[PDB]
Write a protein that binds this ligand. Structure first.
Ligand SMILES: O=C1CC(I)=CC=N1
Length: 129
């Protein structure tokens, strides 16, 4: 837990209003579950440790970090009000990967595979009830 990594994104805050929606339940039970178990999930399952990876410029470049471990905790802790907040977290995670890394890098190929699955799952996001 190096001082050279930033504090991870918030996953708990009693002041933030929270809700469970059928769409959020789908995001946890279907979307996150699908991506979390994938062969290529591991680079995305926790915040980037820039010290362990020797990437001193990572948090110079990436000012909006997000990862699936944070998303998992947000969903498990019912942090969100709506599905769009969670979808935006997934989109931020993918975009950070694409911004920092070169096209065709292994991590990008991995992100692209997960993003394809994500798109399919979000196209099937249920009507809010
Ligand atoms: O599912 C996995 C396990 C291992 I070790 C490496 C990559 N994906």
């Amino acid at each position: 837990g190096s001082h050279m990594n930033p504090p991870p994104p918030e996953t708990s805050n009693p002041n933030k209003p929270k809700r469970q929606t059928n769409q959020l339940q789908y995001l946890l039970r279907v979307v996150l579950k699908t991506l979390w178990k994938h062969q290529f999930a591991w680079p995305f399952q926790q915040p980037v440790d820039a010290v362990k990876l020797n990437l001193p410029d990572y948090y110079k470049i990436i000012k909006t970090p997000m990862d699936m471990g944070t998303i998992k905790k947000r969903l498990e802790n019912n942090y969100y009000w709506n599905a769009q907040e969670c979808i935006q977290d997934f989109n931020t995670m993918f975009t950070n990967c694409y911004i920092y890394n070169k096209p065709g890098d292994d991590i990008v190929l991995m992100a692209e595979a997960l993003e394809k699955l994500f798109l399919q799952k979000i196209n099937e996001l249920p009507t809010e009830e």
